Each structure stands twice: as structure tokens, then as C-alpha cells.
């Protein structure tokens, strides 16, 4: 007799509660879904394949090791699926876990998403709710962000890359999408600085709101950051399908071509 | 240097700068530990480096650094130094500093508490001296308290009269009287000066010596009584009533002179019954007529240049004397060896009053160590910086010869081949002088440089065989350059076509004149024709090293490139001096000649930002005339309010800048006539 | 000019405090060949310092950053400036060498509403597709993505150094205080801890992320040497037409 089925059975069933039930209802609370019925409303119905389910983060400082602090997936949920029949990778960042602050596995795994997005040429698209870089992590947090970024660089003009931000994002989280080919924002709901308003209060001492400095409409209409802005999840959602439709999968491929009426 | 001999296993040295590595050096060399105390800033100096450990005693002020006892007590009892070494200046010469040290174990390496406060002041000195048969320069004993005394004692001394404050130090309190109204006037705000500087206010009123010679008589003493001179030095060349350059010998002298003034100073140190090392000063006039003038109980700042004479070591001396040996050296044992003579390479700049200290961080120090007879004390290194806090005194460079004028030759070598990048020094002021006519010559006094030039340092006023020689080295150098720039490496996709130029024919501006000239290479020599006079100038050509070594028409010649721009300007340090010049093609100029002279408007009638501040407000408006004192705008900056002063009469014409506003240095604010 | 002379004189030109500020022009002047550097744009976005320079007689790109303007903070005009300088400099086969003294980016509702996230990422993308040899020295603070934008070791960089004055660290210690140790209020000997543990090289040289800590004396000639081996540096990219910065 071996314990090996539930220890799987348990680690599945944290994994889809993520950091836990009270916070997946304050997430709500705010009018806000988790990240896994994000990519359920973005994809194909029955296609999603994840990857990296039972990744876990490699911290040892300041009691982070503790099983308390141990989260399998590790504030991200990264995988492949399909828009109308085409093919598409997808990640979206869990602020349920540490805030959907960046670690080690946290980046690890984006990046093996983006490597195999480019090695058989699909769009990837990212959905972005993130406090920014995990402190306790240290420079390894760092060296995630730049890893992503070289890839971002790296895959600029290959296969297109597609930003969606539905929640705040701080510090070195804003740098991705800025690198991607378009960003779109959620109103009311997500944040772009790289400041937050108290440092900005500390250091300038000018008093401004979150809304104010980094909010939706200030990067659509005074910024120039954003592309475009929509009311709430489930329209920018059903926007994000339907723009992804008009793009080709690779710069290999012709532009698509569809009946016509 | 024998190391049989016992002596003390450790010793602290309660100083900065040259003298703590001097020290340090002598200790090394008798195999002695070293303890060096310094301050926060000098924790990477030359002497706590080249000491086996250090102490940090305080912040970068020298009050409390430096001169605070509690912390170099401190740093004694931590480390159990044996013996401390004030070197000069500082606690070299405090009488509490002796006294504290007495109340423990350690030994101060130096003179007597008695002795020191017996020279401490100048009244009581100038009295033991007369008691002890040593001629004085003539004057009034006691303290004036009040301007009628002085007048009085000036009739019946003789109008030239030499106002002076007791106690004194660095050549400040000391004035010059030649009438009552100015004996009086002097008396009164050398009161105020003593009250401000030193407190003291005991004024000395003496009979001032015309066109006197600083003479020194370096003497040693042992606590058994044996007291030795050790010849004699010249420090007639001073400014601010400090000394820059110093002699072994003094021409000016003879062998019977010389023992005379030896025999007096060593029955003043009997006297005092002084057992360390010391000087007796006097001024010597034309005549040949010494009078005593103070004795530093301490060692000499210039004392490395007897030491080239007698071949002996005073530190040496002065740390077996402490220990309580005897001298191993008699009177007849001390000789004349040689030459010597010691320059100040201070980081001052000499077109200002002789000397204004200067503040920076030297990007490059190189000493002319490989030279023949040359000796370099500094406690300076590549990266030091020039502080506010310290004496900003660079190095003391010292060369020995045969005689006098291989070690003048030597000297002007040396300060040719030292290269100081990062400061403004003295090192064209030196050579001026040690290559002056009357120094050669050897009539000097302590109003040389007064004299030598009344309307301040000049610089070199080079000949027309020097200007050629100049010109040809800038020419051939900026050829140089030019034929450097066309060394690429092959191609093989595009070769290279090299210009095939024989003559360049140049205008070059030095000054306000214009010379033509036309140079020609012939691998490593070129050929150049200033306005008609052919020279030949030849060297390696070497464009990145800090010294260049040409050879014009045979003479050996020392350069040194401090700078050089595209449009022809160059900086050249020639005979010491630094030149600047403009190199420009023949078509170049002529095509110049065209160009418009540049009026800069922003010099006057703009308040252009003086430095880069915040300003709480504007006390000026357009159209108000500003006058002289009538501060602009209030402006704070390094933490301080900059409400500058006009200066100057204009009327506002327009204001740029507003109450509370932060404007960086370089930006106009208010516009005015 | 001999490739291998030593430069004493930068031995002490970084503070030991933080507070007070250096030119980055004297170590740029100090390292390259003569003492002579060509700088581009000297007058404008002065936080950054662009140029053209030679070492050991091949032409080389200079970038760093300048603590005696705003504290060496990155904005909208220092990116630009860099940016297109960096880029210029790759596409001619012409190598970049980096002085990082960068504390992070300039905040302000100014430099939001100005886009600096577009001219951060102009600079960040600038440095990371930088196919020709890319060596960078740390001199002090290297905070926050800012030490990724400024030609990081995990951009492609071919050789990093830090001097024994470099701090590398996510940011400066109190915010990392701060945010870690929010519920302990005992942040006495917590700061003390997290400085003595976190604020000096350490951490980046036991990861590998810079290649080594070495004396700022010998800064030149380790350059020189790096750029003798990196001169035959091929790498493949996948293809495309053209890629898409973020102007
Ligand atoms: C490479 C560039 C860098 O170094 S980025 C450094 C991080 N910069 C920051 O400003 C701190 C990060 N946090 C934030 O900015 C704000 O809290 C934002 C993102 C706006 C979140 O807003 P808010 O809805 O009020 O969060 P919250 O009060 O519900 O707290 C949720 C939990 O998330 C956590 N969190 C967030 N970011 C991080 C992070 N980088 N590292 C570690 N933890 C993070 C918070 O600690 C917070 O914890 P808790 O559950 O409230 O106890
Ligand atoms: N009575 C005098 N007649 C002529 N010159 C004098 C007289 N007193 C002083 N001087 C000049 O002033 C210089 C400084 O004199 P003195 O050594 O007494 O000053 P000080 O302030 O005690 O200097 P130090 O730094 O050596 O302690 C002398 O070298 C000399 O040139
Ligand atoms: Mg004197």
C-alpha cells in the first residue's frame, strides 16, 4: 500500500484552490476572477493542456520553507490551448499566491512556456496581475524577470505577443508587457507603475491615487502604454478572442484569410 | 642600523601625512612594529598602509583627529606602544600632551617638557638666550599693552620696527612698522588678530633686520649632556613668511661663521639643557652679523638635507637618545659631504599670491625616483585627494650633488620629470627659482620673491631660442599626431591609401602672435622651419606616455601634453611652465579668418546660475536697478541660503525664475543690463 | 598605450558612504586608452554618459551612469540617449562596455504620464539583442530592474564584474525590511542582519551572475583581455524580417 495516489490527489486539488478559499473570495470581492477561469473563458472549451501543475518554489530564507509557504504552481498557471482551432500559449499570474509576486518557478516556468511557443511557432498571451518581484527571493527574482525579457526580445517579430493586465502591477512586472506587441487593460481594476504612490509621496511629495497614476485611463488616453481599455473581465476576455483572430501564428505564416460574405 | 642594539618593540605615530611615513621607514629600517593613528578619510593613506596596524581617532577635522589626546590615550593602551613619535606640528610641541604621557609608562620621543616650555614663548626665549651669551636681535623686553609704549620703544629702536605675537606660529601675527601712526595702528589690529587667532595678545615690539638670511643650525642632544650642531641650512626663499626651497650649506657663509653659530647654539641647548633633536634659527645680514630668532624643539620639516650631508639619520638619532643611549658621534666626526637643496611641491597654484591652496584628487602622481641623485618624501599616492582640513602640501623633493650646481641641475631634472595630474602645484614657481640668475649667483634674502617679481608669479618669460624650441615640439607632436591617426589595420575588402603629405605647413598661435611654420618627418626625426630657423627635433615619439623626451638641435628637452583638442589647442608643460598653443593647417587659417568672433552676452547683464541650488523667492522684479551688496534671490544650496550679491548696477530687464523653485547651475534666471 | 596598466587612482574614487555622489567620466578617462573619450550628447539627459573611446587600439562603446545627476537615476530622456547609442553600436560591430552605478528608476507622476515604461523598455530591449561583446563592471548600487536594463550578466552579457564596493540587491535595505519583516516591529537588529547579509556582491557572485569581484585597480586590464577573446563572438538568432521595439 502506498500513499502516492492521494499525495497526487491532494497536491491536484491545492493546486486548483491555489493560495485558498478566503483569498480566491476577496479576489472576487473586488470583481476580479481567479486565473484558472480566466484561461477557461479565453480558450476553446476542453483545450487546455497545463504544464508545470506541480512546480514549486526553491526559497529558504526568512522561513520560506515552511509548508505553510509551499504552493504548488506557484502563483502562475502556464499551458497551451486553442482559439477557434488555432493554436495558442497562454499563462496567467495567480495574485491569490504571495501577490503573483515573481520567484525562481515562477519564472522558470513562463520561460519554458515562451521557449516552446517559439519552437513550434505559436502567439503567446499573457494575463497579468502581479505585485511585482518575491523579496524573500532576493536576485533570483531579478534574474527571472531578465530571463523573460530576453526571451520577449527574443521572440520580437517571431510570433506575436499578446500583454492583457487585470490587476496591479509594480516594479519590474510592467517591463514584460511594455516589450510585447500590444497591451490592454481591464478599467477600474489594473494598474501600471513602476512606483507605487507612497514612494512617490516619500520622494516627490505630490499626492496622487493608484487610479491617477497608473490607472487604465491614464495609460490609454495620456500615456500612450496601453492600447486599449475594456469594462471588465469577461468583454476584454471576449475582445482578446476576437483580436487574436485577425493575427497569423507566426511571421512564417501569410496573413489569414477567411470566408467572406 | 644595526639590529643588535635594543630598543623599543613598539612605537606610535601620533602624525599624517610624509613625515608618519618617514617614520615608519626609519622604524622598519631598526626593526621596530609601528602603530598609525588616522582619521575616517585617511583610512587608505600611505601611512597606515606602510604600518603593521592602525587606529582610527576620530572624524576629518584635526581638532578632533589629530589633536585629541583622549583618543590617541586610547589607541596607546590598546596597542601597549612602548614609545610615541609626534613627528612636527600637531602635539609635537604641547606640553600637555608630554605631561600625559609621562603619567604613564610610554616615553615621548622628543625634548623635555622644560624645554619645550621654555621655547614656547618668544619673550622668555629671547631673555634665557641673552643669559646664555647668545647675540639677540635688538628690542624692548617685556609685554606692550598699549600703543604709546610701542611708539616709544620705536623712537629709541629706530623707526624700521618688527611687530610680532608671542607664541605665533606659520608665519602669522607679524607685521612690518615704519612710522608711529603705523606702529600704532599695527599695535591695535595685531591685538585684534592675536585675540582672534591665538588668544594670547602679548605683542613684541623689535629693531626689524634689512634684507636678512634664514639660517638654521641643526642641533642634537643626548640626556647625558653631550650636544652636537650639525652644520648648518638656508630657507631665504619664502613666501607668506614660509619657506618653499632650502639649501645644504649656505653660500653665504664661511668655516669660521659656520663654527661660531654652531658653538651658540649648542650653549643654548646646553642652556636648556635640550636632549633631542632641534634647530637654532638666526637672521644674518649683509655683514655677517647673526642674531638668535627662535628654536623649534622639534624635528625640522627640512631636516632630510642635512641628512644628505652628514650621511646620518635623525629619527634614528632622536629614538636612541629616547631610549637613554649616548651619541656615538663626536663633533669632529660631523662633515660637509656634498650639496643639497630641498623644494616644497605644494598643491597650490603660484599665480595667485605666490601660493593659494588648491582642493582636488590626483588622477596621476608619478616621482622622478629613477633619477640620479633625487629622494622624494610624500605621503601622497595615485588617488589621493586634497582636503580643506590638512596642510595641502604635495612632497618634498631633495637632490644631492658634488657641489652646488650639479645639485641645482639635478633639482631642475627632477622637477622636470614629476608629473602631478588632478591638482594645480607650485613645480613652475621652484624651478623659476632654482634656475633664477641671483639664486645662481647665490645673493638671496627673504625678500626674494617680493622683489624678484613685484607684480606676482609670470610665469617662464621664455627667449626667442626657447620659443623656437617650443614651437618646433608642438609642431613636430601635432605631425605626430596627425601621422598616428592613419595607422589602421588591413582590410582586405577596402585598402587603406595613405596621404603622401612631405611638408605640412602650419600657423601656429602662442600668445597673441601667429608663426609660420613648415615641418617634414624623415621616420623619427623632423624637420622644422619656424619663421626661417631650421631645427631638427628627434625622439620615439611615444604619444601615450606622460613624459615625452625630445632632443632639439642636441639639447635634451622634457615635455609633458596636459591636453589636447581637434581644433589645434594643445597645453604643453615646457621648462616647467605650461604653454598654450593653437595648430592649425595654413588653409585652416586662412579659411578661420573668416570666422565671426564669439560675444558672450551671458558674461554680465544675465544672472546666469552661479551653482545649482533651490530659491525661496525673488527680490527683484523687471526694471529694478540692482546695486553692489543688494542680494538677487535667496537660494539654498549645500544646505545654505545663496542670496548672492549683484556686484555690479543693472536694471531687471526680464526674471526667469520663481519663489521655491529648484534651477541647476548653468540656467538663467534674471536678465539685466 | 600597454593593455595591461594599472589604475590606482580608482582605487578610493567610490565613497564609502552612499549618500555622496562620484564622476563616472574620471574612471571612464582613467580606463581607455589616453585618457580620450569622444562623448555623445554631453549636454543633454547628463544622468547617462554615452561615447566612443579605443582600447588597445580598437574602437569601443562606452555607457554608464553618472551619480553626480539626480543620484545616476534612469527617465525617459537617459533611456532614449542610451538606447539608440546602443543600438548603433551593434549594428557596426562595435563593443559595449558598461559602468553600472544605477539606484533604480526616477519616480513622479512626470515620468508616468511621459511613458517611461515604453523608454525603459526601448533601453532594456537596446541592451538585450546586442549580438556584438557586452562587458560590464558594477561600481556600486545596481537596485530593481534597472540592474536588468543596465546590460545584466542574464541578457546575453559575455563578462560581469563587480567592484568591492557593487551592491546588487532588489532594493535598498529599509523597503526590504520593510515589506519582509512587516508583523515583527523588531527591525533593530533585523536591518542589521539584512545589511550585513544582503547589501555587498555576495549574493550575486555565489550565483554565478557576475563572473568575478575584482580589485578596481586592474579594471583596465581585465577589459582588455576580455575584449582580446570576445572579438570572434558568433551567435544565431532566429529569423525574421525585422523585430518590433517598443518606440
Ligand atoms: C524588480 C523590480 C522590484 O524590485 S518590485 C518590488 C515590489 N514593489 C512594491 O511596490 C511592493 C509590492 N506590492 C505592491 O506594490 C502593492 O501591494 C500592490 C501590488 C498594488 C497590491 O495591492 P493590494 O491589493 O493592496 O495587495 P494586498 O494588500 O491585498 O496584499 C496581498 C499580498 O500580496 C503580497 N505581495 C505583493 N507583492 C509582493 C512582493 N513583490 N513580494 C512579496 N509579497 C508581495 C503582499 O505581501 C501581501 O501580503 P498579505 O497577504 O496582505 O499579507
Ligand atoms: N625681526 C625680524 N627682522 C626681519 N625678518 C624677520 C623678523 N622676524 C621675523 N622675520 C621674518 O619672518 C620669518 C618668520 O619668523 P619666525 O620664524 O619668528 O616666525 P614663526 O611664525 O614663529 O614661524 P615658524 O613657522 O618657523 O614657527 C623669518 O624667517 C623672517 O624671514
Ligand atoms: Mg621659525
Not at chain 1, 211 to 227: I, Q, R
Not at chain 2, 104 to 130: N, R
Not at chain 2, 505 to 515: M, P, Q, R
Request: hydrophobic share 40%.
Amino acid at each position: 500500500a502506498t500513499s502516492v495516489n492521494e499525495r497526487i490527489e491532494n497536491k491536484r486539488r491545492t493546486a486548483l484552490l491555489g493560495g485558498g478559499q478566503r483569498r480566491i473570495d476577496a479576489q472576487h470581492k473586488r470583481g476580479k476572477l481567479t486565473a484558472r477561469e480566466r484561461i477557461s473563458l479565453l480558450l476553446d472549451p476542453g483545450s487546455f493542456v497545463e504544464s508545470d501543475m506541480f512546480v514549486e518554489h526553491r526559497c529558504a530564507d526568512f522561513g520560506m520553507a515552511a509548508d505553510k509557504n509551499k504552493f504548488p504552481g506557484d502563483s502562475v498557471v502556464t499551458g497551451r490551448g486553442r482559439i477557434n482551432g488555432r493554436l495558442v500559449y497562454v499563462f496567467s499570474q495567480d495574485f491569490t499566491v504571495f501577490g503573483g509576486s515573481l520567484s525562481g518557478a515562477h519564472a522558470q516556468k513562463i520561460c519554458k512556456i515562451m521557449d516552446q511557443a517559439i519552437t513550434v511557432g505559436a502567439p503567446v498571451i499573457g494575463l497579468n496581475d502581479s505585485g511585482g518581484a518575491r523579496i524573500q527571493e532576493g536576485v533570483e527574482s531579478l534574474a527571472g524577470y531578465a530571463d523573460i525579457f530576453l526571451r520577449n526580445v527574443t521572440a520580437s517579430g517571431v510570433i506575436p505577443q499578446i500583454s492583457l493586465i487585470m490587476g496591479p502591477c509594480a516594479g519590474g512586472a510592467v517591463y514584460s508587457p511594455a516589450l510585447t506587441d500590444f497591451t490592454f487593460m481591464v478599467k477600474d481594476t489594473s494598474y501600471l507603475f513602476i512606483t507605487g504612490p507612497d514612494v512617490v509621496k516619500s520622494v516627490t511629495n505630490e499626492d496622487v491615487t493608484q487610479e491617477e497614476l497608473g490607472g487604465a485611463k491614464t495609460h490609454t488616453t495620456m500615456s500612450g502604454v496601453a492600447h486599449r481599455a475594456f469594462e471588465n473581465d469577461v468583454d476584454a476576455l471576449c475582445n482578446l478572442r476576437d483580436f487574436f483572430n485577425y493575427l497569423p501564428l507566426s511571421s512564417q505564416d501569410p496573413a489569414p484569410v477567411r470566408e467572406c460574405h | 642600523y644595526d639590529p643588535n642594539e635594543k630598543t623599543f618593540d613598539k612605537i606610535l605615530v601620533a602624525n599624517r601625512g610624509e613625515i608618519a611615513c618617514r617614520v615608519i621607514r626609519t622604524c622598519k629600517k631598526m626593526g621596530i612594529k609601528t602603530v598609525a593613528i588616522h582619521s575616517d578619510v585617511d583610512a587608505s593613506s600611505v601611512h597606515v598602509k606602510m604600518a603593521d596596524e592602525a587606529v582610527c581617532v576620530g572624524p576629518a577635522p584635526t581638532s578632533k583627529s589629530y589633536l585629541n589626546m583622549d583618543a590617541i590615550m586610547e589607541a596607546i593602551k590598546k596597542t601597549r606602544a612602548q614609545a610615541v613619535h609626534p613627528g612636527y606640528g600637531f602635539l609635537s610641541e604641547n606640553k600637555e600632551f608630554a605631561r600625559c604621557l609621562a603619567a604613564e609608562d610610554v616615553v615621548f620621543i622628543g625634548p623635555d617638557t622644560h624645554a619645550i616650555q621654555a621655547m614656547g614663548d618668544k619673550i622668555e626665549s629671547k631673555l634665557l638666550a641673552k643669559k646664555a651669551e647668545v647675540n639677540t636681535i635688538p628690542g624692548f623686553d617685556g609685554v606692550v599693552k598699549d600703543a604709546e609704549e610701542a611708539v616709544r620703544i620705536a623712537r629709541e629702536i629706530g623707526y624700521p620696527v618688527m611687530i610680532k605675537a608671542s607664541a605665533g606660529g606659520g608665519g602669522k601675527g607679524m607685521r612690518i612698522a615704519w612710522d608711529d601712526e603705523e606702529t600704532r595702528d599695527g599695535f591695535r589690529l595685531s591685538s585684534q588678530e592675536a585675540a582672534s587667532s591665538f588668544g594670547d595678545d602679548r605683542l613684541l615690539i623689535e629693531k626689524f633686520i634689512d634684507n636678512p638670511r634664514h639660517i638654521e643650525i641643526q642641533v642634537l642632544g643626548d640626556k647625558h649632556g653631550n650636544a652636537l650642531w650639525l652644520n648648518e641650512r638656508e630657507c631665504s626663499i619664502q613666501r607668506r613668511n614660509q619657506k618653499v626651497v632650502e639649501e645644504a650649506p649656505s653660500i653665504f657663509l664661511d668655516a669660521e661663521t659656520r663654527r661660531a653659530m654652531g658653538e651658540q647654539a649648542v650653549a643654548l641647548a646646553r642652556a636648556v639643557k635640550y636632549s633631542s633633536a632641534g634647530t637654532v634659527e638666526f637672521l644674518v645680514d649683509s655683514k655677517k652679523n647673526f642674531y638668535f630668532l627662535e628654536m623649534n624643539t622639534r624635528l625640522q620639516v627640512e631636516h632630510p638635507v642635512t641628512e644628505c650631508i652628514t650621511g646620518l639619520d635623525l629619527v634614528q638619532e632622536m629614538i636612541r637618545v629616547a631610549k637613554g643611549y649616548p651619541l656615538r658621534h663626536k663633533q669632529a666626526d660631523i662633515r660637509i659631504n656634498g650639496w643639497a637643496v630641498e623644494c616644497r611641491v605644494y598643491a597650490e597654484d603660484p599665480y595667485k599670491s605666490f601660493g593659494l591652496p588648491s582642493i582636488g584628487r590626483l588622477s596621476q602622481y608619478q616621482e622622478p625616483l629613477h633619477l640620479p641623485g633625487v629622494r622624494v618624501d610624500s605621503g601622497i599616492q595615485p588617488g589621493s585627494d586634497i582636503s580643506i582640513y590638512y596642510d595641502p602640501m604635495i612632497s618634498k623633493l631633495i637632490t644631492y650633488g658634488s657641489d652646488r650646481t650639479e645639485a641645482l641641475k639635478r633639482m631642475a631634472d627632477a622637477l622636470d620629470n614629476y608629473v602631478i595630474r588632478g591638482v594645480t602645484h607650485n613645480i613652475a614657481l621652484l624651478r623659476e627659482v632654482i634656475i633664477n640668475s641671483r639664486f645662481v649667483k647665490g645673493d638671496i634674502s627673504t625678500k626674494f620673491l617680493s622683489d624678484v617679481y613685484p607684480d606676482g608669479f609670470k610665469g617662464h618669460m621664455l627667449t626667442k631660442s626657447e620659443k623656437n624650441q617650443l614651437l618646433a615640439i608642438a609642431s613636430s607632436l601635432f605631425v605626430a599626431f596627425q601621422l598616428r591617426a592613419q595607422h589602421f589595420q588591413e582590410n582586405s575588402r577596402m585598402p587603406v591609401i595613405k596621404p603622401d603629405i612631405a611638408n605640412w605647413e602650419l600657423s601656429v598661435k602662442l600668445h597673441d602672435k601667429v608663426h609660420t611654420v613648415v615641418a617634414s618627418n624623415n621616420g623619427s626625426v623632423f624637420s622644422v622651419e619656424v619663421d626661417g630657423s631650421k631645427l631638427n627635433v628627434t625622439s620615439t615619439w611615444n604619444l601615450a606616455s606622460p613624459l615625452l623626451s625630445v632632443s632639439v638641435d642636441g639639447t635634451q628637452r622634457t615635455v609633458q601634453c596636459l591636453s589636447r583638442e581637434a581644433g589645434g589647442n594643445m597645453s604643453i608643460q615646457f621648462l616647467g611652465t605650461v604653454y598654450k598653443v593653437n595648430i592649425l593647417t595654413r588653409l585652416a587659417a586662412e579659411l578661420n579668418k573668416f570666422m565671426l568672433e564669439k560675444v558672450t552676452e551671458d558674461t554680465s547683464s544675465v544672472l546666469r546660475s552661479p551653482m545649482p541650488g533651490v530659491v525661496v523667492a525673488v527680490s527683484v522684479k523687471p526694471g529694478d536697478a540692482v546695486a553692489e551688496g543688494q542680494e538677487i534671490c535667496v537660494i539654498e544650496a549645500m544646505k545654505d541660503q545663496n542670496s548672492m550679491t549683484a556686484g555690479k548696477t543693472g536694471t531687471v530687464k526680464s526674471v526667469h525664475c520663481q519663489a521655491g523653485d529648484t534651477v541647476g547651475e548653468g540656467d538663467l534666471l534674471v536678465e539685466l543690463e | 598605450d600597454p593593455s595591461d596598466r594599472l589604475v590606482p587612482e580608482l582605487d578610493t574614487i567610490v565613497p564609502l558612504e552612499s549618500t555622496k555622489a562620484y564622476n563616472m567620466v574620471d574612471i571612464i578617462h582613467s580606463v581607455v586608452d589616453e585618457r580620450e573619450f569622444f562623448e555623445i550628447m554631453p549636454n543633454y539627459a547628463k544622468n547617462i554618459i554615452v561615447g566612443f573611446a579605443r582600447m588597445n587600439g580598437r574602437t569601443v562603446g562606452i555607457v554608464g551612469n553618472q551619480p553626480k545627476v539626480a543620484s545616476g537615476c534612469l527617465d525617459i530622456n537617459s533611456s532614449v540617449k542610451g538606447a539608440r547609442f546602443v543600438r548603433f553600436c551593434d549594428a557596426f560591430n562595435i563593443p559595449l562596455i558598461t559602468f553600472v552605478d544605477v539606484p533604480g528608476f526616477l519616480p513622479g507622476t512626470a515620468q508616468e504620464y511621459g511613458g517611461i515604461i515604453r523608454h525603459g523598455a526601448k533601453l532594456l530591449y537596446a541592451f538585450a539583442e546586442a549580438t556584438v561583446p557586452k562587458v560590464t563592471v558594477i561600481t556600486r548600487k545596481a537596485y530593481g530592474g534597472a540592474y536588468d536594463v543596465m546590460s545584466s550578466k542574464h541578457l546575453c552579457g559575455d563578462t560581469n564584474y563587480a567592484w568591492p564596493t557593487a551592491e546588487i540587491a532588489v532594493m535598498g535595505a529599509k523597503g526590504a525590511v520593510e515589506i519582509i519583516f512587516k508583523g515583527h516591529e523588531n527591525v533593530e537588529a533585523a536591518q542589521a542582519e539584512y545589511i550585513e547579509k544582503f547589501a555587498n556582491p555576495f549574493p550575486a557572485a555565489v550565483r554565478g551572475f557576475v563572473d568575478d569581484i575584482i580589485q578596481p585597480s586592474s579594471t583596465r586590464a581585465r577589459i582588455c583581455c576580455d575584449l582580446d577573446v570576445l572579438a570572434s563572438k558568433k551567435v544565431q538568432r532566429p529569423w525574421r524580417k525585422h523585430a518590433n521595439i517598443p518606440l
